[PDB]
């Protein structure tokens, strides 16, 4: 008690609020125009699309942790509480997008992501920065599950920067804000190590304090240490399939551990190969064109002993990150050296300091408005 009844108090309030918005958002523009006109606060009935959905994201896997196999609540969640909110006419305000954010919130918990080609296609409503932060939050995981991290590195930098300009002012998140700050920290630290030396994209969102800490971690996982990947996985393992929070850790049920194992077994099979991928590419391409002795200078470094030195290097060439070539007549290993650029980070903040002038000009003239 004090949890499970309040779980059911919430869910029955949630599945009722799943019904009140499933009925009155399809043919009616009548209670909607009643909701536009007589309540002047636009917040509250857009709060309920996030307040009641985030704690539904909690309470569904709260029961599903006990009801592991042969489980009720995700079918109670998605098909009846979320998909009833998903496929309708839009509440033409910040409700119709957040019903999809209610759906994609559990369509991310379910690891079944493919419909991110659909979720942004029917999202032809105005991408408000309230929803745009939650857009690049949810959508960027499918790019993180796309194994093309050179495109994923730029998406998680947006949501971690928090100069994406959100300001609401009615506890809208709700009650959980730095968890988004800490998860995108770990999702971008996931993207910091995986591609370096190419980023050089860890500078804006991740500040110089965590550039030193996770960057020294970025060295060690590439210089060989699995402790960083253990830090990179175990800090991030609930961060792929968190409800928001579990129920109560106990010894007697075998139940709670059974979806806890399901959170472990999925996302360790993916990124451990990427931990080996970070080690293969890790050496700096010091020179583009190696002779055989300096091919054997890097065949030494690729993997020696002894057997299977050329073929292991052949495996380690073919990881999308070593575009190379053997000149079999010349004995001339002809490879790449891809390098990047730094200095151009003053063109973005030149308007941000033009904002930092204007944002200082704004509220103090708003203070001057309250003392005019």
């Amino acid at each position: 008690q004090w949890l499970w009844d309040i779980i059911d108090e919430f869910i029955y309030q949630f599945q009722s609020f799943s019904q009140y918005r499933c009925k009155t958002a399809k043919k009616s523009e009548e209670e909607i125009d009643f909701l536009r006109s007589n309540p002047k606060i636009w917040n509250v009935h857009s709060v309920l699309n996030v307040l009641h959905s985030l704690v539904d994201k909690s309470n569904i896997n709260r029961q599903l942790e006990v009801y592991t196999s042969g489980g009720d609540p995700e079918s109670v969640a998605g098909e009846y509480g979320r998909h009833s909110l998903y496929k309708m006419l839009g509440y033409f305000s910040l409700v119709g997008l957040l019903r999809l954010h209610s759906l994609l919130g559990d369509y991310y918990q379910a690891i079944k992501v493919l419909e991110n080609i659909e979720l942004n296609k029917k999202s032809m409503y105005s991408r408000v920065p309230e929803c745009q932060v939650t857009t690049y939050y949810y959508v960027g995981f499918a790019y993180l599950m796309m194994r093309r991290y050179q495109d994923a590195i730029r998406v998680f930098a947006n949501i971690l920067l928090y100069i994406q300009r959100t300001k609401s002012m009615f506890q809208r998140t709700t009650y959980k804000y730095e968890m988004i700050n800490k998860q995108n920290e770990q999702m971008h630290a996931l993207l910091a190590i995986a591609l370096t030396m190419y980023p050089m994209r860890i500078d804006e969102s991740i500040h110089l304090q965590l550039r030193e800490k996770y960057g020294d971690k970025m060295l060690r996982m590439q210089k060989g240490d699995p402790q960083v990947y253990e830090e990179l996985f175990s800090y991030s393992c609930p961060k792929f399939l968190s409800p928001v929070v579990p129920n109560y850790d106990s010894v007697h049920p075998n139940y709670h551990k059974e979806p806890f194992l399901q959170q472990l077994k999925v996302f360790s099979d993916e990124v451990q190969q990427q931990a080996q991928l970070s080690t293969i590419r890790s050496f700096l391409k010091l020179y583009t064109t190696m002779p055989v002795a300096k091919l054997a200078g890097f065949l030494d470094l690729t993997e020696q002993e002894f057997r299977i030195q050329l073929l292991v290097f052949k495996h380690k060439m073919k990881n999308l990150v070593w575009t190379s070539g053997i000149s079999a007549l010349d004995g001339e290993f002809q490879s790449a050296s891809e390098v990047d650029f730094y200095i151009d980070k003053d063109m973005i903040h030149i308007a941000d300091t033009k904002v930092a002038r204007r944002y200082g000009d704004f509220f103090i003239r708003q203070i001057h408005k309250f003392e005019e």
Binding site: G70, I111, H315, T323, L329, D344, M347
Partner: protein, 215 residues
């Protein structure tokens, strides 16, 4: 001649609510075998079946699950074998032929095609049931040679292809537009095809920056 027929009933199934409760393991699972027989592919049909095995581990099959897994290996380097790992539990990852083809998928995506075809059971039951798996692996063998390689030895491409010497070597040399090169090579790409610099040519930064700041 079966893919586009059962695609629509699957395509209605995947875009509704028909994929969170394991009641739709008879339209999609044969459609996974339809992907097998024809070497055409849909991913969420595989992926929903996997979700119906993950959400309720009481329906977990072996053939269709490996038909999910082997049609994941035909369409590499897409993230189909990624989404194979996204649902199959580790106790379910240790069953024939789920475990072996996940071990085959370890050797394909990391480009261990020598270690693949050697540790592949050279004829295995579901390799032939997935049509064009022999093609699409040796497509995906010579796929990664296409992007990330210049010039190969005559042995060294059939070594990547696996258990070939010169003939089906040329069936993956004269197929992807590859010539031979002198003493003794296959013209995979050019020597200039290696570096391909992506971000070197920057700092043209006047026109966009001054225009938002001229006034």
């Amino acid at each position: 001649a079966m893919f586009e027929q059962m695609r629509a009933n699957v395509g209605k199934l995947l875009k509704g609510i028909d994929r969170y409760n394991p009641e739709n393991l008879a339209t999609l699972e044969r459609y996974v075998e339809t992907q097998a027989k024809e070497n055409a592919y849909d991913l969420e049909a595989n992926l929903a079946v996997l979700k119906l095995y993950q959400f309720n581990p009481a329906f977990f099959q072996t053939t269709v699950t490996a038909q999910i897994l082997l049609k994941a290996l035909t369409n590499l380097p897409h993230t189909d074998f990624t989404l194979c790992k996204c649902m199959i539990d580790q106790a379910h990852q240790e069953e024939r032929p789920i475990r072996q083809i996940l071990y085959l998928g370890d050797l394909l995506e990391t480009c261990h095609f020598q270690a693949f075809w050697q540790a592949l059971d050279e004829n295995m039951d579901l390799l032939e049931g997935i049509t064009g798996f022999e093609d699409s692996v040796r497509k995906f063998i010579c796929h990664v040679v296409g992007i990330t390689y210049q010039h190969i030895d005559r042995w060294l491409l059939a070594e990547m292809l696996g258990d070939l010497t010169d003939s089906q070597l040329k069936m993956w040399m004269s197929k992807y537009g590859w010539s031979a090169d002198e003493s003794g090579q296959i013209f995979i790409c050019s020597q200039e095809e290696s570096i391909k610099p992506k971000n070197i040519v920057e700092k043209i930064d006047f026109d966009s920056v001054s225009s938002i700041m001229a006034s």
